[PDB]
Design a protein around this ligand. Structure first.
Ligand SMILES: [Mg+2]
Ligand SMILES: [Mg+2]
Ligand SMILES: [Zn+2]
Length: 242
C-alpha cells in the first residue's frame, strides 16, 4: 500500500518517488520501480474495531494459572490451554486467550463469579479457543464453551485436538462456517455442544455448515462435559472422545 512520497535517489526529483508497504518505490519522473523496507514497517496499522477492549496483559493483571477446583480442571490444563485468573478491582476474572498461529493473543474472553462475559482484542468470526494448539491430526473435539474444552483436555492429559467456539452456541453455524477451512485437516469433528434445547439447536446448525461426513454428536448424561466431569461421568466423555 502507498505510505507517502519520498525523494528519488535515482532521477533526482524531490517528491516524485512514492513509498509503499512493500518497501518498494516508484518514480513518476524517471519511471523506476524498485522493491526503506524499514521505514515502511514503522507505518503498518494494527489494532482493531474502535470501542473494543484492549487485550489484558497477564503480567499486569495479577494473573496466575490456578486450577479450577470447582470445575475439575487443574493448573496444568489451564496453563496449556491458555486459561488464567486475573485479580482486578480486588475482583476475580477468568481469561481465555484466543491466540493465532504464531501464539499471539488476538482476543480474550473474560468472565467473573456472577458469570459475566467481556471481550477484548479482535474476537473475530473464526474465534476458536485452543485453535493455535493443533496442526491438524486424526480427530478434533469441538466443545461449546472454553471450560468444556478444558474438561476434555483434563481427561486426555492435553494430548489431543480440542477447541471451543468463540461466541457460544448461537454463532455455532458462523464460527464453524468461518472455520470450515481449518476443521478440514482432521478426519473427524466431534461436535460436543451443550446437552439442552438451545445446545441441541446449535448442533443442528453447526453440523450443516461443517464438512459433510466428518461430524459426530456427543450425548452426555449431564448438562455439559463439565457437568458430567463433576458427576463421575468421565466414562461417557471418554467414550465419545475417541
Ligand atoms: Mg450453553
Ligand atoms: Mg458449564
Ligand atoms: Zn527518479
Amino acid at each position: 500500500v502507498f505510505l507517502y512520497h519520498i525523494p528519488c535517489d535515482n532521477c533526482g526529483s524531490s517528491d516524485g518517488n512514492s513509498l509503499f508497504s512493500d518497501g518498494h518505490t516508484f518514480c513518476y519522473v524517471c519511471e523506476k520501480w524498485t522493491a526503506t523496507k524499514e521505514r515502511a514497517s514503522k507505518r503498518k496499522p494494527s489494532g482493531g474495531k474502535p470501542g473494543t477492549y484492549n487485550v489484558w496483559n497477564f503480567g499486569e493483571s495479577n494473573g496466575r494459572y490456578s486450577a479450577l477446583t470447582a470445575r475439575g480442571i487443574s493448573k496444568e490444563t489451564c496453563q496449556k490451554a491458555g486459561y488464567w485468573i486475573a485479580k482486578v478491582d480486588g475482583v476475580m476474572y477468568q481469561v481465555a486467550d484466543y491466540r493465532d498461529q504464531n501464539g499471539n493473543i488476538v482476543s480474550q474472553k473474560v468472565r467473573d463469579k456472577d458469570k459475566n462475559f467481556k471481550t477484548t482484542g479482535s474476537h473475530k468470526s473464526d474465534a476458536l479457543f485452543g485453535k493455535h494448539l493443533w496442526n491438524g491430526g486424526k480427530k478434533i473435539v469441538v466443545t461449546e464453551g472454553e471450560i468444556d474444552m478444558l474438561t476434555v483436555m483434563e481427561l486426555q492429559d492435553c494430548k489431543y485436538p480440542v477447541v471451543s467456539l468463540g461466541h457460544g452456541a448461537s454463532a455455532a453455524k458462523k464460527t464453524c462456517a468461518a472455520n470450515y477451512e481449518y476443521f478440514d485437516q482432521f478426519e473427524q469433528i466431534i461436535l460436543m455442544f451443550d446437552m439442552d434445547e438451545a445446545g441441541r439447536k446449535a448442533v443442528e446448525e453447526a453440523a450443516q455448515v461443517l464438512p459433510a461426513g466428518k461430524v459426530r454428536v456427543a450425548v452426555l448424561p449431564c448438562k455439559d462435559a463439565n457437568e458430567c466431569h463433576l458427576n463421575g461421568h468421565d466414562r461417557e466423555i471418554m467414550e465419545q472422545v475417541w
